[model samples]
Target: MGPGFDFAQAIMKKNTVIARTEKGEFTMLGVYDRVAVIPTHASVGEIIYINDVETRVLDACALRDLTDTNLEITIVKLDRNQKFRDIRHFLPRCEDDYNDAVLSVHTSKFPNMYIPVGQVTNYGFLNLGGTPTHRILMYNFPTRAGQCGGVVTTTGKVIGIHVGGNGAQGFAAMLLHSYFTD
Candidate 1:
């Protein structure tokens, strides 16, 4: 009787508390509210009467613990008549060398418009290899500061943010759903 291990008595748990900011770390943010409709074309075009919109989420932050730390980001876009538009602001240049940490972001003023919770790759529509593995889920029980890219929703609703990771499989891509617009 030298192999008897019975340990199973813990159902359903939810005690996720990570909110530290006294220059320590751990500060997450993502908020959203959107409603858009402004389109009318009817000369037998079959679409008419549209002008009602609302978009919110005045603050957002959580780019995988800011890696080596040094980021000052500001991005905004709200139009249809809500008006708080300034769709790009930048400051993300991290490079810490011990295990690994490298983040470089410039965004170039909205090309196809997708950098709110940045970290994107389709590889020309999923051809595979060389650029697509972005990870940033700091508290799902996988550490070493690995993973950072945002805008994830499978009913979780985290919209846009990213850092860096590729040092033995730790942190792999996000920001899908055509980058969002509804």
Candidate 2:
């Protein structure tokens, strides 16, 4: 964002959220669990009811901004020119926003394998500070609603916290080293 531009205003592009922090407390933005649940509102650092179960949100970013937990395996469908790729790789950075990312998911509610995770489909967000700083795209990977805070791993490591979804696509909050820097 330009100097003094607020990311909170940009969050509306991802979803309509009202977050207010006072003395480490926040205004609620909680949800009822599903493929994509949309309740009126709640806060991040507080507990809210989902499916009649008590759920506490440590970070609102982890609760409401993850991508689709569903995926399509394409190992045979690997993109061309992938062989020259290095055996080692680095995790994505904010500047690498448009790059592909993989995340594992438990198949169909429970008892299964990693399903090879899914890759980042869409490219960039430009981090315009519309809301909550930054977010990225996650596509058809088999995870679901109420699975908020489920680990989203990239390159076999935890890189994001799966927060929310819409159809087969969901959003992941990018963990930015820039967060505490500024």
Candidate 3:
């Protein structure tokens, strides 16, 4: 027996990856279109390193009210001029509501160690920190600094990107439906 192996397998459709950043250390990033999306606070000129490989940031977006930032459609490689598209499937639907039965997934150096646990007490815009833009708050999971760029999911769909959390609470990009809108 292992931690979260069953739930991890249930959401195997959403593969997990690591993303290194100039703003801070590495965090778990979700996979899509051969690229990964993370909740970030990195600047425009900042280099986003994945697996220690650095690349120029093509585009990034942040909600005006909230500190959480997001990414967009395309990117170009400075070294070889390659293109990476942000897959639409990876983004959530506009009607998708907040899911309380959520899971915070992270990869461990050892295999079969995924502990998909936690429940979103509340998600989406909140009046707590002023007109809440997008944040997933979990009561059980003590979301760490390193997991800031990680992800939160429910029913195999991306609910949000982990931003940061307190002692027994965590935050993320809640109600990602808006991000998928045109």
Candidate 4:
């Protein structure tokens, strides 16, 4: 691991959280002070565990943006008493606005797995059922099942969500505010 490895790890530890359902555990991006984001495919019940802190989903619905289209992201509201690390400034400005090289961080699957640096290759849309979702194309990410996590820059700013893709090429959804807003 390089010097950036430790820094990225710390960012992930502070910004990413774990979501455990009946079948499996997945990663969620800690965006706001009390809100975390997960993929629509992941099963998070009404009452779910967010890194050992008990919380409830805002609603069992796929979050949408102003256009009223599904973003393939779900919002999980944390308890008011719970402390959540905010990463609002770290979010990507746009789907393609990110560093060429970034780190993929997963908190649960590999037990806080270390950095696996990948490059931003392109920006494109993926048909994830409803609306055509925008995703960042990454190369050499080495993603695995249930490894959906925060893909952050070397400087520790989150750029996208590492939802597993084919082989070395992977897909990640840019952290847009629309996905988090009510």
- Which candidate number maximizes TM-score? 4
Which parts of model 3 have CA positions greater than 4 angstroms off?
A: 1-15, 28-36, 42-46, 65-87, 94-113, 123-135
RMSD of 4: 3.1
**In angstroms, how far off is 10's CA in candidate 4?**
2.7
Q: Candidate 3, overall lDDT?
A: 0.46
Residue-by-residue lDDT tens digits, candidate 3, 53-149: 6766555444443354233111212221432334345456553444444444443332223335445555544343333444444546765555554
- Each model's lDDT comes to 0.21, 0.32, 0.46, 0.63
Candidate 2: tens digits of C-alpha lDDT, residues 61-135? 322224532211001111112122221122244533332344322212432123234465433342322333235
Q: Choose 2 or 4, whichever is better by TM-score.
A: 4
lDDT of residue 92 for candidate 2: 40
Per-residue alpha-carbon lDDT of candidate 1 for residues 90-143, written as tens digits (9 for 90 to 100): 111222111112221211221111212222232111111332222222112121
**lDDT of model 3 at position 34:** 43
Candidates in order, TM-scores: namely 0.20, 0.37, 0.61, 0.78
As for TM-score, the candidate ahead, 1 or 3, is 3
Error of 3 at 21 (Å): 2.1
Per-residue lDDT of 133 in model 4: 67
- Please give the range of 10 consecutive residues that has the lowest summed lDDT in model 1: 3-12
Residue 90, candidate 1: Cα error in Å is 25
